[PDB]
């Protein structure tokens, strides 16, 4: 081998571990022209296949309260079998928000059932917005406001649900959608504030005329019934959003790193603990959640595993129990602190 | 070792445990195989809390 | 240097990282450098108050 | 914006518009600073000198 | 060399004299040959192959005819021989030390 000196000449571009994509929009609507998804990523691009109502839907989704939504995906197919192809394409590619302008209540129910099925089995934390659904889940979003007049124009309920979904996709996690003004909307039907609070208690999201402006009453989820241990924070789409983001990021990093390639070890247990601690530190630095507390081994789960193995729990150190081999299984325990948004302010003046 | 002492016919009694262990083994060799086998991480359980 | 050691098979443990630099490189040199070429503007755009 | 070099009539004279490279497609490692011939020139000079 | 055909042994003698004039500090690799005017054209892949063979050949480098390698004629090196033994420069100081001792 002759000695050939060589010098490297390449760029050093800062590398940041990119997390799960958020803010992407899954838009689907039936059309008879150029069947197939449109993947409209460039801003304000309307293919000639899409109709005038489709154009309006794209425009509504494109604008956001704070920022334009990061990615927009629009699907086109004939009106037949909309639910089947929508399910297939959503399983094909992940998303954050979804709305069907022409879904019948049966189609909406099927959408809700599929979404909750994924969120409960596939652990795919995704959200959808629907016009009139009394579903008892939080992933779905219900917006029961009709006769909406936006820009001196009557809009269908699904049109404004799409507009609000695009706005929320444009809403950063720092802000909350409560009390958000709507300049484009010109008028809403008159209704009593008592009924507005009643609908808020129902969890339905409605517009409100506040401070001489049409605004969003609440960011409450469509989840009408909350169990005792559910808590009030679970009623907020903002609070559950960061939980879903954290779940997706943890699942992604686990699939990337901790499956197959690596091996069980109490040392490897500690390394995984350190990695999760660093991730929680990143979340705290994001300031979206306070996250004071830390992670640890699930001691009770390890005890259950040892009992299932038939090993007598007596006559070894508790530290030995913690560091005892878990086989392929892994058990851990953590706890987090979630930060919230400002919605109620009370002060007392003293004379 | 006891099996091979039985094969050689040497008594269990009156001979020390070490003496029985250190007795002649002839051409035969006897070993006890016990180890710890390590497993790869395939599934992880954790419970974050509010 | 670490890659050259692994090619040689000498273990990286139980010596100081400085010894790696002091170690023979087999008639080879391994270096690193930082650069930044000045990039400047053709036409401008500023702000006023 | 096509990566071409052209002449225009500007500032009461005929001058070029940009000093970018003929390379239309600059990769991630090349980028904007590699779009310019002025920078690749000095990189080549330093490489040759070293 | 100098606009003149030379026998292989003539240039081996020239190179031997050059090496005798080469101090131990320097290495004969990549040494320019001003007197040589032209060498037959040949592929760099073949040059590296001959380097692997250990054969020493001229090379046209940086617009100049230069020595490709100072590798020894020893084609086959055992496992414990090592790469340094392939170099005439490295074995030269060992031979000098042996002779002095």
Largest sheet of chain A: 3 strands, parallel
Oligomeric state of the chains present here: part of a larger assembly
In order across it, which strands form the biggest sheet of chain A?
2-1-3
Number of helices of chain A: 9
| Overall helicity of chain A | 25-40%
Q: For the CA atoms, what is the radius of gyration of chain A?
A: 25 Å
Strand content of chain A: 5-15%
Principal-axes geometry of chain A comes out as globular
Number of strands of chain A: 12
Question: Distance between the terminal alpha carbons of chain A, to the nearest Å?
Answer: 92 Å
* N to C succession of SSEs of chain A: EHEHEHEEEEHEHEEHHEHHE
Question: Structural class, judged by helices and strands of chain A?
Answer: alpha/beta
Biggest interface between chains: A-B, 29 and 14 residues
PDB class: virus like particle
Keywords: Phage tail-like, bacteriocin, baseplate, post-contraction, virus like particle
Entry title: CryoEM Structure of Diffocin - postcontracted - Baseplate - transitional state
Chains A, B, C, D, E: Sheath (CD1363)
Descriptive key words:
part of a larger assembly, 5 chains, 351 residues, alpha/beta, 3-stranded parallel β-sheet, 3-stranded antiparallel β-sheet, Phage_sheath_subtilisin (chain A), Tail_sheath_C (chain A), Phage tail sheath protein (chain A), virus like particle, bacteriocin
Q: How would you characterize this protein structure?
A:
Chain A: It comes from Clostridioides difficile. Chain A: Residues 229-351 form the Tail sheath protein C-terminal domain. This is part of a larger assembly, with five copies of chain A. By secondary structure, the first copy, chain A, is an alpha/beta fold. Chain A is built from nine helices and twelve strands. Chain A has a three-stranded parallel β-sheet, with helices on both faces. In chain A, strands 7-6-8 form a three-stranded antiparallel β-sheet. Chain A has a two-stranded parallel sheet with strand order 4-5. In chain A, a hairpin with a 2-residue loop joins strand 9 (207-210) and strand 10 (213-216). Chains in contact: A-B, A-D, A-E, C-D.
């Amino acid at each position: 081998g002759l000695p050939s000196i060589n010098i490297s000449f390449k760029e050093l571009a800062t590398t940041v571990k990119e997390r799960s994509a958020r803010g992407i929009i899954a838009m689907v609507l039936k059309d008879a022209k150029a069947l197939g998804l449109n993947e409209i990523h460039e801003k304000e691009d309307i293919p000639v296949d899409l109709s005038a109502e489709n154009k309006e839907y794209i425009n509504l989704a494109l604008m956001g309260n704070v920022n334009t939504p990061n990615k927009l995906l629009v699907y086109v197919i004939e009106g037949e079998a909309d639910i089947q192809t929508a399910l297939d394409f959503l399983e094909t590619k992940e998303f954050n928000y979804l709305c069907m302008p022409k879904a019948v209540e049966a189609d909406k129910t099927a959408i809700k059932n599929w979404i909750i099925k994924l969120r409960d089995i596939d652990k795919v934390k995704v959200k959808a917005v629907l016009g009139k659904v009394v579903g008892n889940h939080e992933g779905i979003i219900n917006f029961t406001t009709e006769d909406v007049l936006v820009g001196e124009k009557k809009y269908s309920v699904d049109e404004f649900t799409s507009r609000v979904a695009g706005l929320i996709a444009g809403t950063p996690l720092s802000q909350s959608v409560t009390y958000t003004k709507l300049s484009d909307v010109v008028d809403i039907p008159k209704m009593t504030k008592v009924d507005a609070e009643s609908r808020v208690n129902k969890g339905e999201l409605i517009l409100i005329k506040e401070a001489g402006a049409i605004r969003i009453a609440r960011g409450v989820n469509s989840l009408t019934e909350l169990t005792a241990e559910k808590g009030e924070m679970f009623q907020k789409i903002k609070i559950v959003d960061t939980l879903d983001i954290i779940h997706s990021d943890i699942r992604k990093v686990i699939i990337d790193d901790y499956i197959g390639k690596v091996t069980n070890s109490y040392d490897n247990k500690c390394l995984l603990i350190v990695a999760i601690k660093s991730y929680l530190e990143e979340l705290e630095k994001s300031a979206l959640i306070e996250s004071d507390s830390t992670v640890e081994i699930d001691f009770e789960a390890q005890k259950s595993y040892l009992k299932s193995k038939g090993v007598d729990l007596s006559y070894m150190t508790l530290q030995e129990i913690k560091e005892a081999n878990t086989g392929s299984k892994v058990f851990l325990k953590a706890k987090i602190k979630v930060l919230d948004a400002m919605e109620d302010i009370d002060l007392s003046i003293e004379i």
